[PDB]
Structure formats: structure tokens, C-alpha cells
Design a protein around this motif. Structure first.
Motif, PDB file in Angstrom:
ATOM      1  N   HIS A   1      -0.929   2.456   1.254  1.00 43.93           N
ATOM      2  CA  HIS A   1      -0.087   3.573   0.729  1.00 43.93           C
ATOM      3  C   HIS A   1       0.539   4.372   1.885  1.00 43.93           C
ATOM      4  N   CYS A   2       0.169   3.989   3.110  1.00 41.05           N
ATOM      5  CA  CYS A   2       0.616   4.634   4.333  1.00 41.05           C
ATOM      6  C   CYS A   2       1.722   3.875   5.050  1.00 41.05           C
ATOM      7  N   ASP A   3       2.091   2.722   4.473  1.00 35.61           N
ATOM      8  CA  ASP A   3       3.168   1.902   5.012  1.00 35.61           C
ATOM      9  C   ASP A   3       2.869   1.112   6.285  1.00 35.61           C
ATOM     10  N   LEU A   4       1.596   0.863   6.574  1.00 36.55           N
ATOM     11  CA  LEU A   4       1.255   0.119   7.782  1.00 36.55           C
ATOM     12  C   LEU A   4       1.686  -1.342   7.695  1.00 36.55           C
TER      13      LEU A   4
ATOM     14  N   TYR B   1      -4.148   1.162  -2.314  1.00 39.65           N
ATOM     15  CA  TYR B   1      -3.323   1.944  -3.224  1.00 39.65           C
ATOM     16  C   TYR B   1      -4.148   2.279  -4.445  1.00 39.65           C
ATOM     17  N   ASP B   2      -3.800   3.377  -5.101  1.00 41.57           N
ATOM     18  CA  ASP B   2      -4.494   3.767  -6.316  1.00 41.57           C
ATOM     19  C   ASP B   2      -3.697   4.845  -7.031  1.00 41.57           C
ATOM     20  N   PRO B   3      -3.198   4.542  -8.241  1.00 43.41           N
ATOM     21  CA  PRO B   3      -2.420   5.512  -9.013  1.00 43.41           C
ATOM     22  C   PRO B   3      -3.209   6.807  -9.190  1.00 43.41           C
ATOM     23  N   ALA B   4      -4.508   6.743  -8.899  1.00 46.75           N
ATOM     24  CA  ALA B   4      -5.391   7.897  -9.021  1.00 46.75           C
ATOM     25  C   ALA B   4      -4.880   9.082  -8.212  1.00 46.75           C
ATOM     26  N   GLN B   5      -4.209   8.800  -7.098  1.00 43.17           N
ATOM     27  CA  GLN B   5      -3.680   9.873  -6.262  1.00 43.17           C
ATOM     28  C   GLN B   5      -2.627  10.659  -7.031  1.00 43.17           C
ATOM     29  N   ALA B   6      -1.690   9.949  -7.650  1.00 41.80           N
ATOM     30  CA  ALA B   6      -0.655  10.608  -8.435  1.00 41.80           C
ATOM     31  C   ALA B   6      -1.284  11.300  -9.636  1.00 41.80           C
TER      32      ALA B   6
ATOM     33  N   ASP C   1       6.370   7.636  -5.946  1.00 42.12           N
ATOM     34  CA  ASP C   1       7.439   7.050  -5.140  1.00 42.12           C
ATOM     35  C   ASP C   1       6.878   5.976  -4.211  1.00 42.12           C
ATOM     36  N   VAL C   2       5.703   6.245  -3.640  1.00 36.79           N
ATOM     37  CA  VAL C   2       5.045   5.301  -2.733  1.00 36.79           C
ATOM     38  C   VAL C   2       4.649   4.014  -3.452  1.00 36.79           C
ATOM     39  N   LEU C   3       4.145   4.138  -4.679  1.00 39.66           N
ATOM     40  CA  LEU C   3       3.758   2.959  -5.447  1.00 39.66           C
ATOM     41  C   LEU C   3       5.014   2.137  -5.738  1.00 39.66           C
ATOM     42  N   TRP C   4       6.080   2.839  -6.118  1.00 31.89           N
ATOM     43  CA  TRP C   4       7.360   2.222  -6.450  1.00 31.89           C
ATOM     44  C   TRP C   4       8.014   1.501  -5.274  1.00 31.89           C
ATOM     45  N   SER C   5       8.062   2.159  -4.123  1.00 37.49           N
ATOM     46  CA  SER C   5       8.700   1.583  -2.942  1.00 37.49           C
ATOM     47  C   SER C   5       7.824   0.675  -2.077  1.00 37.49           C
ATOM     48  N   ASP C   6       6.536   0.989  -1.978  1.00 36.98           N
ATOM     49  CA  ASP C   6       5.636   0.213  -1.129  1.00 36.98           C
ATOM     50  C   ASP C   6       4.732  -0.785  -1.843  1.00 36.98           C
ATOM     51  N   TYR C   7       3.986  -0.336  -2.848  1.00 32.51           N
ATOM     52  CA  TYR C   7       3.092  -1.255  -3.540  1.00 32.51           C
ATOM     53  C   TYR C   7       3.801  -2.338  -4.347  1.00 32.51           C
ATOM     54  N   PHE C   8       4.541  -1.925  -5.367  1.00 32.92           N
ATOM     55  CA  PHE C   8       5.246  -2.872  -6.215  1.00 32.92           C
ATOM     56  C   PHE C   8       6.262  -3.689  -5.432  1.00 32.92           C
ATOM     57  N   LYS C   9       6.186  -5.005  -5.596  1.00 30.63           N
ATOM     58  CA  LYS C   9       7.081  -5.933  -4.912  1.00 30.63           C
ATOM     59  C   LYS C   9       8.164  -6.419  -5.879  1.00 30.63           C
ATOM     60  N   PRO C  10       9.257  -6.999  -5.352  1.00 29.02           N
ATOM     61  CA  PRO C  10      10.352  -7.490  -6.198  1.00 29.02           C
ATOM     62  C   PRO C  10       9.916  -8.271  -7.442  1.00 29.02           C
ATOM     63  N   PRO C  11       8.968  -9.211  -7.297  1.00 30.42           N
ATOM     64  CA  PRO C  11       8.504  -9.993  -8.451  1.00 30.42           C
ATOM     65  C   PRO C  11       7.903  -9.138  -9.571  1.00 30.42           C
TER      66      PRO C  11
ATOM     67  N   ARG D   1      11.079   9.224  11.500  1.00 36.19           N
ATOM     68  CA  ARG D   1      12.454   9.270  11.008  1.00 36.19           C
ATOM     69  C   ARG D   1      12.663   8.292   9.854  1.00 36.19           C
ATOM     70  N   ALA D   2      12.049   7.119   9.949  1.00 36.46           N
ATOM     71  CA  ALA D   2      12.164   6.125   8.885  1.00 36.46           C
ATOM     72  C   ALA D   2      11.532   6.658   7.598  1.00 36.46           C
ATOM     73  N   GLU D   3      10.431   7.394   7.738  1.00 38.97           N
ATOM     74  CA  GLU D   3       9.749   7.957   6.577  1.00 38.97           C
ATOM     75  C   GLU D   3      10.656   8.999   5.918  1.00 38.97           C
ATOM     76  N   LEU D   4      11.317   9.812   6.732  1.00 40.98           N
ATOM     77  CA  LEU D   4      12.226  10.827   6.199  1.00 40.98           C
ATOM     78  C   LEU D   4      13.383  10.139   5.462  1.00 40.98           C
ATOM     79  N   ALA D   5      13.909   9.062   6.039  1.00 43.55           N
ATOM     80  CA  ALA D   5      15.006   8.332   5.407  1.00 43.55           C
ATOM     81  C   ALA D   5      14.555   7.821   4.036  1.00 43.55           C
ATOM     82  N   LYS D   6      13.330   7.303   3.963  1.00 43.95           N
ATOM     83  CA  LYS D   6      12.799   6.801   2.698  1.00 43.95           C
ATOM     84  C   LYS D   6      12.697   7.934   1.682  1.00 43.95           C
ATOM     85  N   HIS D   7      12.224   9.089   2.137  1.00 46.54           N
ATOM     86  CA  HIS D   7      12.088  10.242   1.260  1.00 46.54           C
ATOM     87  C   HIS D   7      13.437  10.653   0.660  1.00 46.54           C
TER      88      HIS D   7
END
Ligand code: 3NI
Ligand code: 3NI
Ligand code: 3NI
Ligand code: 3NI
Ligand code: 3NI
Ligand code: 3NI
Lengths: 117, 117, 117, 117, 117, 117
Positions: free
Chosen positions: A1-4, A9-14, A56-66, B47-53
């Protein structure tokens, strides 16, 4: 969830933040004191924003195109969820907070389904 | 863009940060000094994180249901854009930063079209 | 603007946030609802702070000694701009947001002139 | 957890971040690439800090005098937990991440016991 | 105080923010204007939170086991100090800001005593 | 320093962070471990940024037009101080950290003079 990425990940945060949003709205109905109302609004705004961020993080980072192809409603679902949170920011009605929670529950269900897959 | 709502939005915010990401990548390609590499990496990540936001905000706050119906590819476009920024975080290749910028240019085009409508 | 340095700067970041500040003040003129006024104040405070930050960065990072020599009034101009933003935080009058925007426009003009030399 | 107070708390917030910390450490052991090591260090530092914040909040806001009386080891336990997280920040050894998780689990157990009484 | 660790700490950071909290409460008594009250509340909330953070850092990072052994009341003292700050957030009474400052002064004395040894 | 205004300022905030910057540089000169160098660079960057922020606040909020008239070199002094902090971010040499501390000390002296005026 940190983009490394870290793979954690866990929807629990939201969900926890959204729960605070609704809890705050309920408290705002039991105390009409001006300063409490100000603090409640200030804090609700902050927790709702965090809830939006987590989704937003789940949407952009966790969930993949498929995932968006397997669940055609996913994009709309997450978008409606963040919008419901924006609505909760501008309202003292606990129903708005609950609506956001309902959308988060649907996202959570899909999240775990993709995890077990 | 602040969720009041204030009615003020501009993809330029996302673009300027994405431009910094690419600029940093090009600078990294020209100075292999350890400490510069560390600082460049740390700052590029921010900066990349800000762009994503910023992109997340356009997607969650500015764009409304009618917009997604008029532009069926909008959801995927923004999602691919933020994913491109995640890839730029994990890379020193300026091409990754440019990929993010190309997607942002496509979002920018759609944004202004909806503004004139 | 990230202090790497990255070589990417644009007064637009400050301008966009200042525009949100004024846009919020204009919306505050139309609605006296308590919770809207609280939220508007909270958010205006946040955007004005970001605007001050962006100007502080141009002043501390972008502008160099040669620039302050060529434009003897630059220090004062930027200082007046951030002070104008502090004044906008403490006001609901769009005139205060306008005053900050006017100073920013003056700073923007000087900025681009220094990009020419 | 927001200090309103809102009445919503869950050690899960601290646990999830701590889990990311350990997960990142495991990844760092398998990939010696310089840039990955830099990014992993930066991100691990951030998630560990968030984990400490969540524990600090439980300690300062949730737990009350009666709790510290019932659990005389609680102050020490939370202090060891945050110190364990500081140790994880300075380490790539997953064992440090696990030690923090062990303490968080003990804190979680006490947290829920206070919810039963 | 940054968790490197850097070896640099000073209770003054917590004190200065706590001084702002009290000063704001003092000002809230001389101006009943709505927007001033809103801004005062918002800002007091922020400074009190920072003060709590600084104290949390001293407790989690600076003070070590030997210190807690030498000062058995330290855990309680710091915990009461942060709780006093939470009380100050929820009050316009300068007395609440003063109570926090008094606990901070006690912590400051102990801090410098451990520094001399 | 919070822009309410609250009437509470102290160059000590900037000084303490600048002290951490130099302390970190001293540690970096003695320990060549890669991971420590990474963490030290990351953290030094953050503390230097806070130092710059504190100085920017004194310049934008505390110092008023009459002060700049009474001390014509104040604009330059603060600007040099923040630039010295940017230089410290890009260096591991404790001398750069000390240079920033020297400028801050000059600012501190003028600050207290204006306070006594
Ligand atoms: Ni992660
Ligand atoms: Ni907005
Ligand atoms: Ni930059
Ligand atoms: Ni809470
Ligand atoms: Ni430190
Ligand atoms: Ni202040």
C-alpha cells in the motif's frame, strides 16, 4: 500500500477511517456546542480525506488491469465510494457516513475475492 | 480540488510534478554519485506521489458520472496514468517519466473539453 | 522546486492555490450556513498555506542573488504576497484573495523574465 | 483515534504498517540493487513511523489510568513496541520487524481485553 | 528526535507549541467573532497535536529504560501531559493550556537532569 | 508562528532542526555503512526542510515592514540562511551544517532586538 510495492493491503484502513467519520456525525447530533461542532467538522474532514486516500491507493496500486475487467463495476464502485466520502465531509447526517461504509463493504468483498483467486 | 468544493481544478498540478519526476530521472542518468543518487531517489518518490494524488483528485472529485459516460475510456486512462507514475518511482529511466507525462497529456485534453462543454 | 535541485519551477503552483483561496471566499459570500462556513474556513486555511509555501520556495530556491540585484523590489514583493495570503486566511472578503493574486501576478512576470536572460 | 474523541480505535492500524515494515525487510534481503535498497529504506522508514504514531495514539488517547492500573506492564510494553519499530527502521533484518509485531500482538490482546470489561 | 538517531532533543519543541495553544485560548476570550473562533479552534487543534507529537518522541525515542528506572513516575507524567494537551484541544479555557505547560515543565526538568548525568 | 496569529515565535525552532542537520553530518563522516548513509541522507533532508520552513515563517509572518526597514540586510540574511540549508541537504560535510547555524544565529539576534523594541 506504500508503492514499493510491499504486497500488504487491507480495505480495513479505509474502513476504520470511514467508521470514525460516521461516529463523529453521530456525536455531532448530541452536542450543539459551537466549539465542539467546529472541532468535529475539522476532524471529520481529516478522517474522510484519509479514507479517500486509502481507497485511492487500492484503486491505483492494488487492483490491476485484469481486476477491472473481471469486475466491470469496480471503477464505478470505487469512484462512488470516494464521492460518498466527499458527501460525508459536507454533511452531519450519519446516513452519509453509512453510505460510504456500504460502498467500502462492496469493495472489501471484491478485494478478498481477488486475494483468494 | 480541495473538496469544499472550490470549483478550481487544473491538470497542471499533476503535470508539473510529473515534469519534476522526469527531470530528476535525467539528472540521475548524468551523476552516479552515491549521495546524489540517494537524494534524487528520495525526492523523485515524493514528487511522483504528489502527481498521483493530483490525478486521483481529478478522478474522484472533478470528473462526474456524465463525464465517464461520455468518455468510456476515462477510468482506465487515469488508472494507467497513476500506475505509470508508480513505475516511474521504481525507475531511473526518463522514458518512464515521459510515459506518465503522455498519459497526463491525454487526461489534460479530456479535462479541458469537459470545461468548454 | 523540490530542492534536489530538479530545475523545474512554475509560479502556477502558487497561483492555482491562491485562486482556490479566492474562489472559496466568493462561495462564502453566498452561504451563511454554519457548517459550510466552518468547512470553507478550514479548507481556505489549508490552500492559503500551500500558496505561501510555493512562494517561499520560489524565493528561497529559484531566485538567486543576481535576481535580487536586477529586481531590488523582489524581496519586498514576495514578502507582501505571502503576507497578503495570511490576510486572506483571516478574511472572507474576496478582495483579500484578489490582492494576493495581484502580487503573485507581479512575481510571475518577474519569474518569466528571469527565465529569458 | 482522532482525538475528538470519536471512540473508534483498533490496533490493526499499527499492525498493518508493521506488517509492511517486515515485508519490506524480507524483500530487501533478496534484492541487493542499489536503487531498490534506497526506495525500500525510504518507504520502510515511513511505514515504521506511521506504526509508531498509531501506537502512541493508543497509549496517549485510548488507554486511561484505570487501564495502566490493571496492566502495570502496559507503559513498558508500548514503549518497547515503539522502540522495536525504531530498531526496525535501522535494520534490514526481518527479525526486527517481527519483534515489533510480537509486541503489537500483546498490545492488541490487552486492547481487546479492555473492550470486554 | 528524528529517529536516525541524531542525538539531538529539546523539550522546548513541545513547550513552544504548548505556549501557542495557551496564547490562542487567551485570545479566544477577547474576540467572539465567528470566523476568528473557527480559525482559533482549527489552529489550536494543530499546535496541540504537534506538542503531543514532540512529547511522544521524547517518551519513545529519548527516554530509555535507565531513565524510567531512575524516574518511576515518568511514564505517568508524559501520559498525563499528552492527555492535558487533548483536554486543551477540547477547551477555550487558558487553564487547560496552562496545565499542559506545567507538565511539560516537569518533563523538561527531568530531561536536563538526565542530560547532565 | 501558526498564522492565527498567535504571537508566539522563536528562532529556536529553526536552530534545533539545524543542529540535528549538523549532528547527522558528523555521524555520516564516521560511519560509511551504506544503509546508514541512506537513512542519514533521508532524515537530514527532512530536518533541513523543517529548518527552512521555520525560517520562512519568521520571514513571512513574524518580521513586519518596519523590521525590514530597520534592518535592510534581513531579507538577504534569511535568504542566505535557507540557501545554506539547501546546501547542507546536498552535503555530508558538517561545515555546511555549521554555516547554516551561523546564519540562524545572526537572525536570532535581530529577532530578539525587534522583540525588545
Ligand atoms: Ni505498501
Ligand atoms: Ni478544491
Ligand atoms: Ni524541485
Ligand atoms: Ni478518533
Ligand atoms: Ni532526531
Ligand atoms: Ni503561531
Amino acid at each position: 500500500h506504500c508503492d514499493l510495492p510491499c504486497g500488504v493491503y487491507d480495505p480495513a484502513q479505509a474502513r476504520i477511517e470511514a467508521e470514525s467519520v460516521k461516529a463523529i456525525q453521530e456525536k455531532m447530533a448530541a452536542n450543539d456546542d459551537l466549539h465542539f461542532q467546529i472541532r468535529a467538522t475539522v476532524i471529520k474532514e481529516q478522517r474522510a480525506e484519509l479514507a479517500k486516500h486509502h481507497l485511492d491507493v487500492l484503486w491505483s496500486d492494488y487492483f490491476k488491469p485484469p481486476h477491472f475487467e473481471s469486475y466491470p463495476e469496480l471503477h464505478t464502485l470505487v469512484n462512488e465510494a470516494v464521492k460518498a466520502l466527499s458527501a460525508a465531509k459536507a454533511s452531519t447526517d450519519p446516513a452519509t457516513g453509512q453510505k460510504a461504509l456500504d460502498y467500502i463493504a462492496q469493495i472489501d468483498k471484491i478485494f478478498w475475492e481477488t486475494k483468494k483467486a
